[PDB]
């Protein structure tokens, strides 16, 4: 009469050097593009 | 509570201090072992000294000498030997009890089995191993089998049990004391026969016991009245009859014994001289008695060792760092009383 076991994680170390053709880096690049790109001195995408 | 876990403190301190302040600790404790049994004072004193124990000594070079006492009672039927055995086994914190053929073979020693919880083999100990650092009570001692007698023989010898059988070759630790009971060969004792022919057990086994009490039943119209009054009063009430004496409960007895077990008195030169003189006299005396076929055994160095252990136990009970001549006097007094029944 027991319940279900859990699973979880946490970061400690640094894995291998991140390649570019990986989803996490793709997402990081896209997030940077959203949060930084400027046109006519404006953050168009952030504002919209 | 185990003796090993003892620890001084105000709560124990005030109780113990009150007990000593009351005084007469020796007799007061001795009279409190099974207070429902009339008479039998010296046996009770010997049992108390057995409970307290002697002083272990490490002589160096790996050699070792025991510090525990062994007691045998041998007597006529119907004198409450079993009652005393029960009382001592109950008072002891690690006491074990056994009777004759009821426990035999692997009942003593140990047996090889497999643990359910884990998947490793183990040895399950018998009464002797279960009573380690405690008192083992053996009723109907004379009726035991040869193998069990040999096991007790070796245990009283050196506190270890050696086993070499199929699937096992080892040695077990049995740091335990022995309290045994026995009856004469033909039931009642026969004064027209020698003491060694009155019993079935070997003389060497009898000799290895530190104390060997003989209890006979000689009718006496005077003391029989006292015994009858005592027993019938005990039945009519549920208490002992005396009023001028108050027994001390087992908890306090264990407390004081645990406190005492922390001492380690030492021998001095004057007491050493007294002991050597006494031993020489006793050893010279015993020879003529044994010649007439009227002795359970000739005096031997085990007797001297027993005297030393008893003196140490008395000192520990007194709660002192050094022994005195009175302790040796009392030890010899007891050893002399132990065979007074053979001279009536």
């Amino acid at each position: 009469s027991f319940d279900r076991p859990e699973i979880y994680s946490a970061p400690v170390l640094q894995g291998e050097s991140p390649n570019d053709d990986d989803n996490t880096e793709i997402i990081k690049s896209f997030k940077n593009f959203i949060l930084e790109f400027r046109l006519d001195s404006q953050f168009i995408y952030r504002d919209q | 509570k185990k003796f090993a876990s003892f620890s001084l403190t105000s709560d124990v301190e005030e109780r113990v201090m009150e007990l000593i302040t009351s005084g007469d600790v020796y007799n007061r404790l001795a009279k409190s072992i099974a207070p429902e049994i009339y008479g039998n004072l010296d046996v009770k004193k010997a049992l108390l000294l057995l409970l307290v124990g002697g002083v272990d000594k490490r002589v160096g070079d790996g050699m070792k000498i025991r510090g525990d006492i062994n007691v045998c009672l041998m007597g006529d039927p119907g004198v409450a030997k079993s009652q005393l055995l029960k009382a001592i086994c109950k008072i002891s914190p690690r006491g074990v009890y056994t009777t004759g053929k009821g426990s035999s073979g692997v009942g003593l020693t140990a047996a090889v089995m497999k643990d359910p919880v884990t998947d490793e083999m183990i040895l399950e100990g018998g009464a002797l191993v279960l009573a380690d650092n405690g008192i083992c009570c053996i009723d109907e001692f004379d009726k035991m089998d040869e193998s069990d007698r040999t096991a007790i023989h070796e245990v009283m010898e050196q506190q270890t049990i050696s086993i070499s059988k199929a699937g096992i070759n080892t040695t077990l630790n049995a740091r335990t004391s022995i309290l045994a009971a026995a009856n004469p060969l033909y039931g009642r004792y026969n004064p027209r026969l020698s003491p060694l022919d009155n019993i079935n057990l070997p003389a060497a086994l009898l000799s290895r016991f530190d104390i060997l009490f003989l209890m006979l039943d000689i009718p006496s119209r005077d003391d029989d009245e006292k015994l009858a009054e005592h027993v019938t009063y005990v039945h009519m009430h549920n208490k002992q009859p005396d009023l001028d004496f108050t027994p001390v409960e087992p908890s306090k007895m264990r407390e004081y014994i645990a406190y005492a077990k922390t001492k380690r008195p030492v021998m001095s030169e004057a007491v050493n001289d007294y002991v050597v003189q006494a031993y020489i006299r006793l050893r010279q005396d015993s020879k003529r008695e044994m010649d007439s076929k009227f002795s359970f055994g000739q005096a031997t160095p085990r007797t001297l060792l027993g005297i030393i252990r008893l003196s140490q136990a008395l000192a520990k009970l007194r709660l002192a760092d050094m022994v005195d001549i009175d302790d040796v006097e009392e030890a010899l007094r007891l050893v002399r009383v132990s065979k007074e029944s053979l001279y009536q």
């Binding site: - | 919880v117 040999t150 050196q158 050696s162 070499s164 699937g167 060497a204 001095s268 031993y279 060792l305």
Partner: protein, 676 residues
């Protein structure tokens, strides 16, 4: 200031963490590689034993390089002396895994620096390429295997015990060898923490077929592994606690370095692991299994004699071949050898040694002398073209039950290297020889050794020899008469060696040895059997005031102070002398001794010529005189047996049975002639 090359284990342990002002603090630990290596180098280059002034470890490294040894035995206690390593001690105790590799790399770099900075010779490639290792052997005191907690896993500990069984060598894979079944291209893969990563595709550009890699078993590279079953003997035992046996894992060079019956002291790492519930599934059990990993083994001590080298001749050559650096016998210094010679030079050597044995037991000069001669042992002949004769000596003790004929057995048991102490009624024929048992782990049937085989090369102590059943006693005949045991049981047919001496005790019938009856009516053994023993000792107790006073004073002196303080040699020197004498000398007999031997044997046969009144003489007594004379000559560092030796042997053999105080007609004993 020296050269350095990183090791694979160091690179693996490279990944650092922050929060340590040096940086490079391994996650989970507190070890710092730079400080540990620096402290180790400083300690190695500067430490003296405070001969106590010289650089202790610099030499050891020098002889290591000179001889080609690759293993450094490090006493973990030393690190507590030097001020720097006061913390490295605890670091080594708590995190052995990383620390050992750190020390190994430091040692290799130290060796390279030592060889190069002095321009000794240019042949350094061999040392630069070879491996090194360090073995701690003096970890602090432990409290027994029972008292460790789960938090003590992966710590360093030490144990003492008795070896019982050893599984055969188990091959352990290290490099797997795959082949492509379409292009014959072969690959090698190195194990990683016990997992092999099988390839999923041939790596050739021309051949890229998926799942074409097969494993060739014989082409892999394997290591050595062995499992030992140990019967531990902790110093402190709690209430009501019984033994069990522990599992030890030995790897690489240490395999086959132990034999059942040996008493050893091991230093290892405490481990844990889960076990599969069943072979079919891959489920595991929550409750873990514990064992030990051996990193050092000590097989010598100063409290007991060295193993008789005559029984381990081949094992020494195998040790030399295997390059394992475990030592069987202790080392002897020039000062010690000179002291041995000086001690042998004096004239009271015999009595001095006799008194030295068992100082706590009084008098019994002849008994102690017999024990000494037994320990020394006779000479072992070996006949080219087949034939064996051994110098083992058997002794029995009869006498009054209350004498000190039992304390002797304990002392001999604790001083001898191998042996077993057994009682008479608590034994059995199978239990003394061998048996088959089901291993609880492998679930198979394996043979296990008995007391007599375990005691090979040592002493077997038997108590209450007269209570032994006839069936059990039957086996001793061959052991005493050929030092072998033949077995014909299901699955095994062979003969085993039993090169052991016998020390037995017995009690007289009834209460006391009656001097009004012959020895045959006082001892409950068949008269023929008593003729097999080399010596028979009649321990009689006579009442005498002088002796009583002496013994009582001797006993009562022991309680004067809480600790023992009792012209006696120390046990260490005694054992050293006995071991040296046993190993280095081998006496031989001469014609002058032969004539006396023949004359004495003929006289013994003639004297006493109505029967079953005395132990009749036999060839066993002639052989006993031979052995005793050889042992006496071997003592005191002589190589030729002589007339004095033979006379002493005959004197002792007669005195043991005390024929002087015996009536040669009725076989009785006169108490006024026997001397205390």
């Amino acid at each position: 200031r020296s050269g350095v090359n990183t090791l694979d284990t160091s690179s693996s342990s490279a990944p650092p963490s922050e929060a340590s002002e040096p940086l490079r603090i391994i996650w989970g630990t507190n070890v710092s590689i730079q400080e540990c290596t620096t402290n180790f180098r400083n300690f190695l280059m500067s430490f003296k034993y405070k001969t106590d002034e010289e650089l202790y470890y610099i030499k050891q490294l020098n002889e290591m390089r000179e001889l080609g040894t690759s293993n450094l035995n490090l006493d973990a206690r030393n690190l507590l002396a030097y001020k720097q390593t006061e913390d490295l001690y605890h670091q080594l105790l708590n995190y052995p895994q990383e620390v050992i590799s750190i020390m190994d790399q430091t040692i290799k770099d130290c060796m390279v620096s030592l060889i190069v900075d002095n321009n000794l010779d240019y042949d350094l490639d061999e040392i630069e390429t070879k491996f090194y290792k360090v073995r701690p052997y003096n970890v602090g005191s432990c409290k027994g295997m029972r008292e460790l907690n789960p938090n003590d896993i992966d710590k360093l500990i030490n144990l003492k015990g008795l070896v019982l069984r050893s599984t055969p060598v188990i091959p352990d894979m290290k490099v797997a060898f795959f082949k492509c079944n379409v292009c014959d291209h072969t690959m090698a893969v190195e194990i990683d923490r016990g997992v092999i990563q099988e390839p999923a595709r041939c790596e050739r550009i021309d051949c890229n077929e998926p799942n074409s890699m097969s494993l060739i078993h014989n082409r892999c590279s394997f290591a050595d592994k062995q499992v030992i079953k140990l019967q531990e003997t902790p110093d402190f035992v709690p209430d009501g606690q019984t033994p069990h046996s522990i599992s030890l894992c030995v790897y690489d060079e240490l395999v086959d370095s132990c034999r059942a019956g040996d008493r050893i002291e091991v230093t290892g790492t405490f481990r844990s692991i889960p076990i599969r519930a069943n072979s079919r599934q891959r489920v595991l059990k929550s409750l873990y299994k514990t064992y030990v990993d051996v990193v050092h083994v000590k097989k010598v001590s100063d409290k007991r004699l060295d193993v008789d080298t005559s029984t381990i001749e081949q094992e020494l050559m195998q040790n030399k071949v295997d390059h394992n650096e475990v030592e069987e016998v202790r080392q002897i210094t020039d000062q010690d050898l000179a002291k041995i010679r000086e001690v042998a030079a004096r004239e009271d050597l015999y009595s001095l040694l006799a008194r030295s044995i068992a100082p706590s037991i009084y008098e019994l000069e002849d008994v102690k002398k017999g024990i000494l001669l037994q320990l020394f042992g006779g000479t072992n002949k070996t006949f080219t073209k087949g034939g064996r004769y051994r110098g083992d000596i058997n002794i029995l003790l009869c006498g009054d039950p209350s004498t000190s004929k039992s304390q002797i057995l304990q002392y001999v048991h604790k001083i001898t290297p191998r042996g077993v102490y057994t009682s008479g009624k608590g034994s059995s024929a199978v239990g003394l020889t061998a048996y088959i048992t089901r291993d609880v782990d492998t679930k198979q049937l394996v043979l296990e050794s008995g007391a007599l085989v375990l005691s090979d090369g040592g002493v077997c102590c038997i108590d209450e020899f007269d209570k032994m059943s006839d069936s059990t006693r039957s086996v001793l005949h061959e052991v005493m008469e050929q030092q072998t045991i033949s077995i014909a049981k299901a699955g095994i047919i062979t003969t085993l060696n039993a090169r052991s001496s016998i020390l037995a005790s017995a009690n007289p019938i009834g209460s006391r040895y009656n001097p009004n009856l012959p020895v045959t009516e006082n001892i409950d053994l068949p008269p023929p059997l008593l003729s097999r023993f080399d010596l028979v000792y009649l321990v009689l107790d006579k009442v005498d005031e002088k002796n009583d006073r002496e013994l009582a004073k001797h006993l009562t002196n022991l309680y004067l102070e809480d600790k023992p303080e009792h012209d006696v040699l120390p046990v260490e020197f005694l054992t050293m002398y006995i071991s040296y004498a046993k190993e280095h000398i081998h006496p031989i007999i001469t014609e002058a001794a032969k004539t006396e031997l023949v004359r004495a044997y003929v006289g013994m046969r003639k004297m006493g010529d109505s029967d079953e009144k005395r132990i009749t003489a036999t060839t066993r007594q002639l052989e006993s005189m031979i052995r005793l004379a050889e042992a006496h000559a071997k003592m005191k560092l002589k190589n030729v047996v002589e007339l004095e030796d033979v006379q002493e042997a005959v004197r002792l053999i007669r005195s043991a049975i005390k024929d002087y105080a015996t009536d040669p007609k009725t076989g009785k004993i006169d108490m006024n002639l026997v001397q205390t």
